[model samples]
Target chain A: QGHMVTILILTDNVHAHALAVDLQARHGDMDVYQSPIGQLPGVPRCDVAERVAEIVERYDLVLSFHCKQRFPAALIDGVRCVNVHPGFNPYNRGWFPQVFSIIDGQKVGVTIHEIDDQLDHGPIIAQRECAIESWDSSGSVYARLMDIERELVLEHFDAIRDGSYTAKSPATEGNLNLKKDFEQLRRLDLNERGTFGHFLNRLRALTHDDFRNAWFVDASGRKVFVRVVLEPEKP
Target chain B: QGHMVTILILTDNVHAHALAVDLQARHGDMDVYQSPIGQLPGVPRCDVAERVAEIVERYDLVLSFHCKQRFPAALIDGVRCVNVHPGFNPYNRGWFPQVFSIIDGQKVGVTIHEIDDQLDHGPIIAQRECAIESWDSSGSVYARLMDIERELVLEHFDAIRDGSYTAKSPATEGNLNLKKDFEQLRRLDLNERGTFGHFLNRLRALTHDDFRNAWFVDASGRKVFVRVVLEPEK
Candidate 1:
């Protein structure tokens, strides 16, 4: 159940860096290289599908962790590619998964699955549902999701390397969100009259420390930033 | 309570007509005239406030029932004006209170209050909170509100006519909705991402049999009408 696997870890965000560091540390004997998708030598700058043969020959396994860019169909078809999604696959399977999970009242989790042509649509190697509190923001939920994802991937890394892991087919017709969907969530309608609970859900879902995503237009037509400030109870 | 009082009832909607009919039947001895706000002989077509002195001389009390038009300051100040609002005063004070009440999770009720210059902002003569079910729509809730308003106004009619009814001041800082606010409620954002419960709430709030209020735009930039068809259990 083992061989000298040439593993390619695609790292794009801060969360991906942690997994990349751990993988390189643990798998010192194996052929492992962590790189951004665009920085890879053999892959073409724009048309990655053209260089599918070269990428396939170089890496035995391609693991995508927090990679923003989508893989070409030819490349995915040519190589054994696995994605570390920060959401439970077949649900909130697109941009800002945690944000949609909170707004849509869907389950929030992490999934490691083989990369297919469709967005986050593939047979799952391992996935775990993460618990979220009512006060959980997108930023907070994301942090916990990344922790779960890294652990899940590392636990199954050996099986993945040996090609011994069993994959489960996810249920069909799950919700999909695009980049445009998150943009729409950021827009706060000043005249929107709804329940206080729903209003709070929207505000908190978009509330992040670094990004000023939530905003509404005033009577003067000026953009006013909106966010919820929550303080934890001191023991 | 013994003297005959000339009462002027402003009738505009079907619900208003019911009240007008009952009032005329009961108070045959007293002078009662039911007319639309604009159709009143003394009230000016455009500016009703101009003939405030004449209206004040003709009637001792003026009752507004489901009247769409706003009363001018002069007319309100000139006579003892009372309004039968389809919402609890101090909450959902303006256009389509029932719709906003359902969406905003505010109390749905009836309030008969002394009309001041503000929109539904007045000293309450009689008010009662109405129950709303999870399946209630804007149209269904409206029907129930009218029933409550009719009963409330009739119960307080004698006290109101005799000038013996007390009015408690409503709590300050209640929510207010304008005509534009209801217009905003009718707009359905197709790209809106939220819970299914909230989506259903928005749909039912704007739904009515006579009006095609809720609508969304398609990718082709055409308006797509939206409404929920709910069938009760047999």
Candidate 2:
């Protein structure tokens, strides 16, 4: 058995470093490990399941940092593993939560859920809502969502550690569910006949910087990668 | 010679449909030819350059819709083709502007430049900046940028038509230029560390959706496509 609460961060961004730095400063007893598990310029790639399982052997509960759907099965079966998703559950389950909300002209929120093999398909623990304004960009909405997530995660962790928290399944009622499939993601265009607000929301929901861009073949058969943008009329 | 102002709308999104509708409603004499280029689902893929060239013969200046770097070389060489890029040029030139900004922690913006055969490496016509706040997401930034683009495009068009617009090349001092390379892009993490804000900016810069994912082989040695999110602490 390992420490009572062992948090393993699996990510490929500098933010992971920021989290590690913050966590260590707050919790003296908390064992924080930053194992970047994706393709980065200088980072080494490892077997996510194997590396996580090795860590799980010593840890009590596993807290993954902004990880997508690559949670290890062992962690799910044996230990308690939690994921922090930016999108509200049962609605925007895949990439670009803000964009999806904006595209649908709805609201945006963040959810923390129990990790399952399925993508963002899990039981909800806690959630916080953020308003999507007309002037908001995908970057701005994400920063706000991250701030919300930071608060939610800390609150949930305190509750869990104090034995005052009980995890519950995601609420099925009033949940507007959608899948982030590659095929559907491929067809989005800001210049198409759609509401710029909604399109912006979809772009927010579906993309990021580290691996940002949608794929398409140009007129000359060269593969082209693009970033979607929506500039609302100046107030 | 064709009309002094000939606009070529090359797009696959519903925005194109809206633009076409708005143009026809606003101007009755504008001969708007909708040459839907690129390979989209349910839409037949045709030779974008050939078709544009055939049409350019009838026009004086060609204004394209959303095709930044992908405009056919033949079309560019034969006529004046302008592109509306959803980023502050020279800095965020390649894929995932917002994503890059989020990862790099910088402000995001927009630019409209004359199209050259070499990607976004074009002379600047006009460009503007937009502040990206912590609450901004990829969708919000893009929508805001596109709204700016629509107005800028119209203004630039008027200036060019009236022989009052002077093209301004991108400033040479401390210009942070970038180019989108396929090999480098395929190795990105589409999920987790990958934020939506950045992804949407990339989507806007790249001008298509097929590049939305980061392709990789998992630990199991199986090919995987991912969309990254920033992990919030809990």
Candidate 3:
């Protein structure tokens, strides 16, 4: 609607700040809107929807930076919304991609896709692969993924802004991850896997410094939390 | 002293029943005393200390078969006790041996040993290793080991009664699994071990059906219990 590009970045914290800084350096002027969601210590947040359409009324394009919460399964007709998702296509294409990504041992990545009626199922804008080191936790993997997302977005920012902004559409279909999937992922059943194949998957997936650690109960029905160790235990 | 080995088998329930059946088949007319413990579903139980040593005064030898409670330390001064233990000599030498044996890839075994003041630290009257295939769980391992226990107990019962039953203490050092060890064993910390070393340990350990499955809380701080699978998972 205007001469210069006015982008309303929906995301926060250092990751958000760094992303905003990078976007500004490339595109000139951009607005950083922190999403109010998690009650994580030392951080503030905020959301978007048809309601978000109204919020971004004057702005031409809206970019969602890992925005918390969701909109109705409908598109915001007035504004062109795109997202930078910390997930690879067809694998962990839904919530908590990092957790599932580790569990599946699939290729981990980041994608910038157009926002449509479906979640994480829109046409692709930009994407790049991220490395998941054996020493990586959810926090570390996610941290590195952030940089990948930033790099990809920056590499294609100008193209994304141009009227000729042309992006790729995913050839293969993807499975959407559900709330139940996350619930199931967090639970580490030692009994399920044959020789620790899948059990290790859940364990590694849940090994993040941020939230609750993996755990189990004793015969006395008591709680016992677990952590991954780099060395031998109990000598 | 009785002419035949008039043994008072101090044991319990199904596991006890199976061993008793096997014992009767070989050593006929054995006295079965159900050792009362286990807040588990069935069975009324009791204990043995210095006071209860009087209870066993009439018997020649008290054979404890999977008894839950232990007698007073000095009772060792009173009775020559021996029973089956499903544990290797040095490793998992206490309760839940099969559980820990699987976790550490330690040699799974059964031992018929003299019950001393110490727990499973008694000298080895007789012992034999049991098979622990990768597919085995605590339940399967323990179940098969029970039969092995019966075999060893019967094999050594005659010698034990003849007063020639010689038990041997370990010459080398070994780890003794304790109550705290059982507690630690049940806990499956995902953080320990590499890609799969530790988790596989826990999987085979918790194969027992009744109690103590591996568990963890969700990000939402909710409870989650897990069992091992023989196949790939979702």
Candidate 4:
């Protein structure tokens, strides 16, 4: 029954590669093409949007994992496009979810949703919520989420293929954060009269190892990037 | 002829107030309502979206001058909604047009377009391109654009009333900038290996009097907000 499936994977990452491999193993004769990222060795590169006519003819479903470019309207309408998002469905839709979760205290997790025209505005296929610890930074939260993300994909891949899972709409429209929202947070008001707790929350939210996000202007009027580390002393 | 026309003014500024006054002078019997802003004395406040049904029943057209809120889909579909945008249409569509103009080197001007579903993505009713000086900052360009904006409205008010002006589509879809685009520019890559010309251009583009935009990271790891002043001394 699984042998009849045809899928197009638009993604770039080791996790995506692993998922692709497992999908192949499950569906013995199923056709799979790694179009954009070229995760598969023998598969030729073909962008879904550029060659949508062919894509529609070839693949029954399109799965996107960390695809940077937004799917074109043509591609979306032409085929069923599903996205693997880092944030929990509906709560944190756009941009960095973990960062927003720390500052705004929204639900944070991995979601597999059927992509619509709008950004992350789609019906949920499968979702799993992740807990945010008080001491968790953006990086820590992100790392933990990714771990859960892979597991969620593995668990839901079978139902996603056969259309066995019932798609449900999000209850309410949650907050959508852009890069500008995070940029606004980075600008630490030296003379902030707000609660000290929220101020520290902002700092903790932005603290990451890979990118220099959180910063404050010093007395000398220089941009000083800062990162916070919370640790308990080893006995 | 203009006396029969009806307009709903959705704005909050002295420039908008002046335009409303002049429109009143021209069309003596013309019906006008400053619903949201409450600029007109003795006029009760009423939200356009909350009371769009009554608005549609009352007004013939809606002119939005620097209105912050986006017109809901129902409001746009119900009545004619025209916007006075700061940037030339189809070129710089959203957010700070002038800032994007300097950074992206796109056309800078004042645009009066019929607001469609998209942000500043609409048919052009009237447009005038403003020249950007080499020493221009976001503030300077914005100030100059506003001056041209009022004049454009005054010049084209009558045509808009009678629906005589031909609405033309923008030749090419222009770059749409969001707040993120400007915010991305604000981040100065201290370790940038790009051209010095572009680096300075970024600084000049964001240098505004009111807001702290352009910034750099010092060795000690602190954000230092910076602004550039270019002037010919007397």
Candidate 5:
């Protein structure tokens, strides 16, 4: 309430938009720009980045939510940059954390952390642990995780506005992950699982709903996709 | 040199195209009809299947190579239909034979069999044993297997056309595999496969190159994707 904040949001999804709108209405001096990822029809990739890089250097507060690109350290050196991640931290500090959460039988949640040179390895600002049911797929778990992230992080915006927010070091050292780590996880060996309960654990972990399903290649080398349901058939 | 065979190809992939071309150019009576799998643009799903099914009934011989659909029993009841599968049989007779081959430490190769309505459990027309390296992705092993299948099946095609081919039984009986059978095999336990060597064996068996890589979700629930390479240094 005492001071207005100039903000820059690097976003990839709808939740970021809502958060941005709320912050702007509070401070009334917010600027939103996207850090590019993949391809966007007719726009020039480099041309877009050149401008976003310039704005990054000038913004007082840079907020990241689902922004694919890593922000340059030089721009974030003195700026107050915060990121919202959809996963439990220290135990899950990288890409697709919820999917990894179910795979490892770990607690899944959300984290709001400071932006630093090291990726996803930053001082934890706030975090909330969410429930991971035995039947949750990547889709269902992710949706819930994002909702919790929004609530937990927004709870701290007032503290941040008054310059009273605290950032703490994560209690445990967590491992990071990459996109390519999923290769062997998509295929299953029926013989190896041995028991039905053991097999269902693999199915729930590997199932990504529509994105991709666990599969096996046939004698013809053509892979077949399927979803596994461990429950008994309906009467 | 001999009478050309009227052929219908129930297949998917480019190797089939070249094989069909050479057969038609040489024998001159080949009519290769492709059974559509996914929606081929500009046509209804059933529309394409109706035509391919018709061609299957009209053609003298039907050759299937990696075709996705299950050919109706009526289509192959007595018609000379042969298929090439990637794993050895009666031991390696199901889907992803190379996967099964590696999992069980069995030899992996190719099989040419008559398509009897019982899925991959058909009478063995011909079989060849190929090498499986300690480190090979499903792609590399599968590509080599397909090449072997082409050569082995071609050697028997002439005999098949001359009505002198003998479709033999597999030396030993092998088991069959369904899609669900592979669910758990896709995941790995770092704690379980503690040693690097055994861990690598899983990596090579399940890796599908561009399709996906060896991955595991960490304690944080983030799934990491990576291609594990055993080579020493860059």
Candidate 6:
């Protein structure tokens, strides 16, 4: 009854909340704190560095949930913080991980790594890969990745705690930022220069009905918007 | 030795550069500035309104050449500035027009309209729609839209300038700002989630090497990136 590991789960939205609930239910001995960050409603909002510091004082190990990068400052000097990057690290490092992989015609995967100050630049702990089939949408790929992630995290966590884990360093350099371009963000249209599949893949990854809507200019030069719900491709 | 009207051509990038060269060689009287707005390599970065105010003072009628939405601010308020949006307007109002449309399962088109502070949110001038057969990519749609836009801009520029044009107000609300989401900028993979015909369409639209690379995380936790150059299907 003397398991001395307390894990703090930092997250953002409903998805993170759900994961927190599952982790708590499954690992009751491990203290799980659902510290949500970013714009999600009904979630705790705190500075990454400061929050991590607070959690580090109480917990032995830190496991971040659905966080892109920032960590609490207090935990920076000591303590191990692991991030679950939904996309393969270094390649799909910035944002829109699954959509970007599909557009590039590569397989999608997930990265579990030691969180560092730099963006996605850290020692690797474990990774799981999935095929991006021709029929795969962001929604489909995401579901599969989440499944793989659960098993991968469990496997890695057990190995590390047992002192049987070895960390691998990332080789790539250069940070990929996800800031929107003013021009590209302002005008929307399909032309000879664009790809239909690639476009849809991005939409599938970035959008969800009642969440984010895609917008464009209509024939009359008026702004129009549409949101897509994940459903079976119509017959 | 006198012309009835003058056309001030605003352009940037390869398409604009080529158009400017061709127009200058054929039409001696036309003044083409190849305006310093849009995607020029080394144009001094300034506010859009300031740039438009500076450029509008010299020209009566402004004709944009594949300039996208980088029209000068002065033209929006003072002179007649015309542009060609490479997608069916009132629908594709944000970034990556052709790509976004195909993803949404819609047709591709082009719109020639009066330039204003708001992009693609101006009054209707003219538009031409094209089918995005399952085989279209962003590049392919761009080529088709460009052809249509060049023709439409040339054909309508005179009527629009001679005071013989009646601008059509947009059917939808004019001031709506449908900004593009940051997540949508990531590249898409057509091989897995797309159909055979979909793959073929993207291939046909892509110009050999002119494709954006897709980004993903691999099973090993390494980020894998690749670009589709030639259509892999056909």
TM-score against truth, every candidate? 0.49, 0.43, 0.51, 0.46, 0.48, 0.45
Q: Runs in model 6 with CA error above 4 Å?
A: A25-29, A34-47, A72-74, A160-163, A174-187, A195-211, A226-235, B1-234
Best candidate according to DockQ: 3
Candidate 1 residue lDDT tens string, B8-57: 77655566666766887887643334443435444213234565777787
lDDT score, residue A62, model 2?
Answer: 65
For the record, the alpha-carbon RMSD of candidate 4 to the native fold, in angstroms, is: 25.6
Q: Tens digit of lDDT per residue, candidate 5, span B52-143?
A: 46755567777776543466666665467777777777765666778767666787887777777666767887789988754466767888
Q: Give the poorly placed runs of model 4, Cα more than 4 Å off.
A: A21-24, A28-46, A232-235, B1-234
DockQ of 5: 0.02
lDDT of each: 0.72, 0.56, 0.65, 0.73, 0.63, 0.57
Count of clashing pairs, candidate 5? 35
Off by over 4 Å in 5: A1-3, A38-53, A189-195, A229-235, B1-234
Fnat values, one per model, are 0.00, 0.00, 0.03, 0.00, 0.00, 0.03
Model 4 lDDT tens row, B1-234 = 244667777655555656666777877644445556566676446677688788777777888775545787878877888888888888878887888888778898988888887788789999999988655778888878878987898899888887888898898887777878778987655556443335435666887774778665544555555555443212
Ranked candidates (TM-score, high to low):
3, 1, 5, 4, 6, 2
Candidate 3: stretches off by over 4 Å: A1-235, B21-29, B39-44, B50-53, B67-70, B190-193, B231-234
In terms of lDDT, model 1 sits at 0.72
Give candidate 5's error at residue A86 in angstroms.
0.4
**Model 6, span B1-234: residue lDDT tens:** 024445566665456546555655655545655444556565333444555655565556666644445454546667777766666777766454676566565555777777766766667688888786433456666777667766775676557556466667578752212334424334334334534334433333332233433344433444433333221122
Please tell me the TM-score of chain B in candidate 5 relative to the true structure's chain B: 0.81
Q: Taking the tens digit of each residue's C-alpha lDDT, what string does model 2 give over B121-227? A: 57777877877643344555676766776676666656544335566776752234344443365353323243333444443333323334444443344453333
The candidate 1 chain A region of ten consecutive residues with least summed lDDT is A40-49
Write down the worst ten-residue block by lDDT for model 3 chain B: B225-234
Candidate 2 global Cα RMSD? 20.6
TM-score of chain B of each: 0.88, 0.65, 0.82, 0.84, 0.81, 0.70
lDDT (Cα, tens digit) per residue for candidate 3, span A1-235 = 2338777776644675567667776666576666666344454444555355455566778777777656444434557778778898757777878877777777778988887766787788778888765445576788888778778877887767763567677887766787677866564454443433345556557766636556554434544454442111211
A best-first ranking of the candidates according to their lDDT comes to: 4, 1, 3, 5, 6, 2
* Model 4 Cα shift for residue B228 (angstroms): 31
**CA shift at A102, candidate 3, in angstroms?**
7.4
